Amino acid sequence: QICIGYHANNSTEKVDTILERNVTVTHAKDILEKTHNGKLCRLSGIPPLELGDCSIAGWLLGNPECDRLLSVPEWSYIVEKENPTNGLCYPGSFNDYEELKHLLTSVTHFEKIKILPRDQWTQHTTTGGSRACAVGNPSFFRNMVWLTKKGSNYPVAKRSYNNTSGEQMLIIWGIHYPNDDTEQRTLYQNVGTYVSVGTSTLNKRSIPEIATRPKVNGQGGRMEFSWTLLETWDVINFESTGNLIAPEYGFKISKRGSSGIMKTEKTLENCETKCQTPLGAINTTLPFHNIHPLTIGECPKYVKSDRLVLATGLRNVPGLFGAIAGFIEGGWQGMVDGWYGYHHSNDQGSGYAADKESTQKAFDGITNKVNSVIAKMNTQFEAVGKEFSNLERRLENLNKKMEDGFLDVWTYNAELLVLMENERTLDFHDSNVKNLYDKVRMQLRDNVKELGNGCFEFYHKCDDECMNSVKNGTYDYPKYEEESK
Amino acid sequence: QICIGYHANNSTEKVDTILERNVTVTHAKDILEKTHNGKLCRLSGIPPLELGDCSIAGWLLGNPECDRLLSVPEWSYIVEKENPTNGLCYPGSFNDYEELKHLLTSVTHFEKIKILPRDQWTQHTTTGGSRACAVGNPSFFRNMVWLTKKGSNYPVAKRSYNNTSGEQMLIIWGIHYPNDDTEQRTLYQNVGTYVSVGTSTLNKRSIPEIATRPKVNGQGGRMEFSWTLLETWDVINFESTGNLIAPEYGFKISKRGSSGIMKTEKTLENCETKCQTPLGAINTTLPFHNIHPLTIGECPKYVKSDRLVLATGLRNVPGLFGAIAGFIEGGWQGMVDGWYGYHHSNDQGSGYAADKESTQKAFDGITNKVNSVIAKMNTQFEAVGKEFSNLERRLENLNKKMEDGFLDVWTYNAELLVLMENERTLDFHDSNVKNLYDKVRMQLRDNVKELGNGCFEFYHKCDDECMNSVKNGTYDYPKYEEESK
Amino acid sequence: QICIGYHANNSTEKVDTILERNVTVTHAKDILEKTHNGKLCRLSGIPPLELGDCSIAGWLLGNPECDRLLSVPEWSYIVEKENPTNGLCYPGSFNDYEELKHLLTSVTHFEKIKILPRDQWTQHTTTGGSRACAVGNPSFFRNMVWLTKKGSNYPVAKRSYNNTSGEQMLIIWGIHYPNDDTEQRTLYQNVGTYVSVGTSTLNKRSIPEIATRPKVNGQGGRMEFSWTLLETWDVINFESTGNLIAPEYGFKISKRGSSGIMKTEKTLENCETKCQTPLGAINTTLPFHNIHPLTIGECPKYVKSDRLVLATGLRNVPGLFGAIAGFIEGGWQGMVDGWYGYHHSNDQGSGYAADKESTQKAFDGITNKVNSVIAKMNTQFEAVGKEFSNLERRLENLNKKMEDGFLDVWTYNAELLVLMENERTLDFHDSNVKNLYDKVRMQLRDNVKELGNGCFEFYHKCDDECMNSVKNGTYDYPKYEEESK
Numbered sequence A, B, C: 001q002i003c004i005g006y007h008a009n010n011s012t013e014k015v016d017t018i019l020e021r022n023v024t025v026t027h028a029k030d031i032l033e034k035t036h037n038g039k040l041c042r043l044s045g046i047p048p049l050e051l052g053d054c055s056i057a058g059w060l061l062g063n064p065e066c067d068r069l070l071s072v073p074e075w076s077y078i079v080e081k082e083n084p085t086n087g088l089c090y091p092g093s094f095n096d097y098e099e100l101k102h103l104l105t106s107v108t109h110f111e112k113i114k115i116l117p118r119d120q121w122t123q124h125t126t127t128g129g130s131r132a133c134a135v136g137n138p139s140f141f142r143n144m145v146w147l148t149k150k151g152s153n154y155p156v157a158k159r160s161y162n163n164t165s166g167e168q169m170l171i172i173w174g175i176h177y178p179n180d181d182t183e184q185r186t187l188y189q190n191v192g193t194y195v196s197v198g199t200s201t202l203n204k205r206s207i208p209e210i211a212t213r214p215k216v217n218g219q220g221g222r223m224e225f226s227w228t229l230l231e232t233w234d235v236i237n238f239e240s241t242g243n244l245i246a247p248e249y250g251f252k253i254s255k256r257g258s259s260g261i262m263k264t265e266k267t268l269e270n271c272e273t274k275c276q277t278p279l280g281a282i283n284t285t286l287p288f289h290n291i292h293p294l295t296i297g298e299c300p301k302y303v304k305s306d307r308l309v310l311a312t313g314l315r316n317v318p319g320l321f322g323a324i325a326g327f328i329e330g331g332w333q334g335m336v337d338g339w340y341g342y343h344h345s346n347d348q349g350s351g352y353a354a355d356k357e358s359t360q361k362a363f364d365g366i367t368n369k370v371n372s373v374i375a376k377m378n379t380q381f382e383a384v385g386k387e388f389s390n391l392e393r394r395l396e397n398l399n400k401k402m403e404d405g406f407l408d409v410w411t412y413n414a415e416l417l418v419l420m421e422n423e424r425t426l427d428f429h430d431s432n433v434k435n436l437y438d439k440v441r442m443q444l445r446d447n448v449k450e451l452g453n454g455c456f457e458f459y460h461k462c463d464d465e466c467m468n469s470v471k472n473g474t475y476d477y478p479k480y481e482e483e484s485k
Helices: A056-061 A097-103 A181-188 A356-375 A393-444 A467-471 B056-061 B097-103 B181-188 B356-375 B393-441 B464-470 C056-061 C097-103 C181-188 C356-375 C393-447 C464-472
Strands: A002-006 A028-030 A078-080 A092-094 A110-114 A130-134 A144-146 A157-162 A169-177 A195-198 A203-206 A222-230 A235-240 A244-247 A249-253 A261-263 A275-277 A296-298 A309-311 A340-344 A352-354 A448-450 A455-458 B002-006 B013-015 B023-025 B028-030 B040-043 B078-080 B092-094 B110-114 B144-146 B157-162 B169-177 B195-198 B203-206 B222-230 B235-240 B244-247 B249-253 B261-263 B268-273 B275-277 B296-298 B309-311 B340-344 B352-354 B448-450 B455-458 C002-006 C028-030 C040-043 C078-080 C092-094 C110-114 C144-146 C157-162 C168-177 C195-198 C203-206 C222-230 C235-240 C244-247 C249-253 C261-263 C268-273 C296-298 C309-311 C340-344 C352-354 C448-450 C455-458
Touching: A002 A393, A056 A097, A092 A097, A097 C393, A144 A169, A157 A244, A169 A195, A203 A222, A222 A235, A235 A244, A309 A356, A309 A393, A340 A356, A340 A393, A340 A467, A356 A393, A356 C393, A393 A455, A393 A467, A393 B097, A393 B356, A393 B393, A393 C393, B002 B393, B013 B309, B023 B393, B040 B275, B056 B097, B056 B169, B092 B097, B144 B169, B157 B244, B169 B195, B203 B222, B222 B235, B235 B244, B309 B356, B309 B393, B340 B356, B340 B393, B340 B464, B356 B393, B393 C097, B393 C356, B393 C393, C002 C393, C056 C097, C092 C097, C144 C168, C157 C244, C168 C195, C222 C235, C235 C244, C309 C393, C340 C356, C340 C393, C340 C464, C356 C393, C393 C448, C393 C455, C393 C464
Parallel strands: A078 A261, A092 A222, B040 B268, B078 B261, B092 B222, C040 C268, C078 C261, C092 C222
Antiparallel strands: A002 A340, A002 A455, A028 A309, A110 A249, A144 A244, A157 A235, A169 A222, A169 A244, A169 A249, A195 A203, A195 A235, A275 A296, A340 A352, A448 A455, B002 B340, B002 B455, B013 B023, B028 B309, B110 B249, B144 B244, B157 B235, B169 B222, B169 B244, B169 B249, B195 B203, B195 B235, B275 B296, B340 B352, B448 B455, C002 C340, C002 C455, C028 C309, C110 C249, C144 C244, C157 C235, C168 C222, C168 C244, C168 C249, C195 C203, C195 C235, C340 C352, C448 C455
């Protein structure tokens, strides 16, 4: 007796296919990454700029509450709170704020130079402060200078600066909007003041917009700050008859490319990632994850799925070709050195023997299928998270419409890819067993009867050495011409 | 004698496959929804704000032509004509208009409130009107007040409002731009006038731009409107020496999400949908539709295709496994209670009996195939259509480039899905038939003769309970040892 | 004897399937276009507007270095260098420049009309020039008029123009920002000047800002230009007390759709395409290419792949159904008129004969498969390249994140489509052979013996007439009852 069978085990591993659901399989592979390390790490050897609970505005201006900030010269992404607590301690806005944040998202190299020393403002008062930026005496943004009148005079304030630092330089200035005409006169003496700033390409003139406002942080006044990148060997001109908040420092900056701000509560924790999420770092080979949409780095695609499992083994039986769970009704728990093999009732022993060469062709194939699915996915560095003012609601909605559009597409493709390929994997094994059976039938023919359960009854004495002529595809028909039929 | 066969009927359904075109099939399912109810319906219980032929601006300002408007307090989307006939009856612009429309696109909750009563502008005149907003007497936007001179004086107009309504409040104001220096004085006496508006975050000061302009609605002047959201318990301050168009009303407003403006002339009708289009509402389980690109709601994916028919039954004849339309050269008109079955020529009679074991595995399977294709589609709520000013041409083009890009992707994938899955459905049936035939052959053997056209000729007698033993898989070889050969 | 077999040849064409790599195939089709003509062509009959090394700004204003420019009236895209040498010869900015470039991207119809002739500026000096626009006396943009004082006076400059031209007209004006108070007097005499421009919808008043600036092209002053579309039968009104840079010309423009600007150094070169890239033109039926991402026209999808070969022939051997390179161990070099066929050994001769019928079914099926993959692709017209100022980094990053999104999607889908469909083409051929073999075995039966690699040994005499019957499917069992067994 010779029998063609297939492998079985104690697996409870389930998969879905196009045609059937919850189908138990021999071996399987999850291709969806769902675990992180819950840490917040450094991105490819380069740390994040950690802001604690300051805002970029607050950090750059020199809010006294950002003094203990600790600044690296490099950083690869920024960490901020979804709602920071130390920003403009003096009320105001920041022109093109989001553009500025996006510009500082990632940096070479970035250092703070002193470009316009306080004391050189010789005809003006410099110590101007406010209870709003208080340390319990009134202080002010440490990087800026509030030029006010000296005595009863405010002469034209006018300085320039040639960018000799060798690198593109970020420079910030501001204009102060008083609460009323009287407060204007006591700070600046003059009424029709203006702030004028100009470079080669920049060319801007502001005038104070005096108006009655509710108090924010106990102040009815406001400051509107602006910023420019001063190109190398170019000069920036300030001229003002009042209301200027002058920079004292500039920031040398260089960039390789762009990145993201990560909105989170966590804190850098000393490690390494190629891919960071607000919940933790991801180290994975798999092509999909479902951890968090807002990642930074080279990440697996984010999918709205919570199971993506490829069958690799075979239908676990305690098809399209009619073999597995077909004319060969069940699998063999015994044979464990292959996926398909032989079982023989003889006069010596009996008798499980794996078909190495056919199990090998299949380990190769299925290994290739898995690797096709995984290795064909392209993962370049991206930043996902994005920033919009509350007058860019449409733009923000456009961005969400896009992220969501790709999310729907990848999920659908993934789900269906897994389902379709699982149906073909099973048929694959089913075909392999069926061709095994046939690779024996077309060879025995008359020296055996077709029993049914994938068995052949021998018309002669087939000792262990004859049973090996069948297993290795080299059985001779001529030799056994004994007709017991 | 027992024949193996498969179902055929009078159907004329055609599907396409990867390898074949116009292939007549037994049963099919169109997975492309292309019918609407020609009605404009309310969305998950909540109706649309119907603007008739007014613009949002005309509505909010109180254009007199928008009096019999009817205003719901809720609304889930807005209906507006492509080009409304009642907007600014007095010529002018509206700062950040598109952002405002996007804000009002859906709403909790929306209530107009008198916040600055006219008659309390005690030192100014209120009955300012124009022929441009005629009723046939000069009139004006009903929600605004045109402050002008009282005698030969226009003092500092200065009022404020604390938002005690417990909701976030929309507030609009405008400044006037006269056609020439003389028109100005007859209206405001003063010449260096300004308009000042402040809140906690708002801070604005506008000055009039006197200049000769072509007459729109017989008017050379222009009115430039602005708007802000005043937060709860915050106060807004107005101050002006002339040219201020003050609001009388504010609008309490709350929001959960965003929605969209649907261009169309149809009117609300009193039905319901999860999904609306400018042509009619859609009610469907199907994953795709081709009615119209600009839907609002939880919709199927829009595709360029105009036919996605999924084969569910089998090839219909008067394959890959070479049974169907192959070695069994035809289907059976007769048999109608299964897809595959038997036909016995016996001394009692004949002979059609469907096969319930395999026909059920197929219903099961093809059912799951359809459900997988449908139930994997992710359908959240979206609004598609958007709005852009004539200086956001690039941004609009970005949006189109985006909507067009997904359209191409979903079309291609749906078209190919159907083509591939159809080829594999037919091969599924072809296989089920081939396996039936094989399950019978492997049960008889010696006891019967393989004819060629799918039949077995018995080498012995076989009454009815002889067939009912083969069909159910319970046939015992040993009992029949007559070898008429 | 009669044997079934398949085609083989001397191909070294290789394809990848889901299960195998580097598989040598009988015939194949590359579906990735990889070649361009290196020419810069015209798009569907319509040329590009070529700018040499001017910028659109310099071209419209009429920079004297653009005299040789060659202006056509139609054009389907614009060719510009990455960084053009002749732009604003006199330093300045250009309000909403990117929107203007986008406007002019494609054009009907485009024609320069003389709308405000120089000489009619009778109260002012017109020949105002600058050394910055030297010809080697001072000159100026040829399409603009630099109004300066005549004698010691500069009367209110006031002119209007009503667009009677039958098309929408683009108009450009400018305001001069001088370097210092004396430059202003020597040019304009007056002190608190203004520039007023108005139409139906446009309404701008501009006062000049005198300030000290770095010198660019030797100028401290700056000129800011603005533009508008003057609709038909509308009028534009200029009024100015100095500092106006007036138009002399407007541009009748008409637009069907939109296009793009192509950045490259190449020149128009007198040929044709439906699809243009900065490297050269593409003439192709294929659905995919990898030449360059920035195309213009009706183009194949761009993918990161650099090999998309579709198998069309069978495994080459000099599978899933166990025929090809399976139970029939190899192919026939010498069957050159079909994919599958017969080899008869006869008393007469022997004996390769291609099977016309089934080879055709295959040529048909694979033709369809290739046409389905190619023809389902949606090649609408798009421009791709896009322009953003340096304060639109976010917006530009938004666009990049989108182009990449689609690139990643199309690439993955194409790669896997090929792999999956290759796996099934091979298995298709395999199936055809297996079935042709069975179509003989079921037709002979007793009358022949199953030998080995697809061979049947006849139990009777078979002449070249009997042979033909087996081949054409007519052979009869009854006739030949010679039972040499």
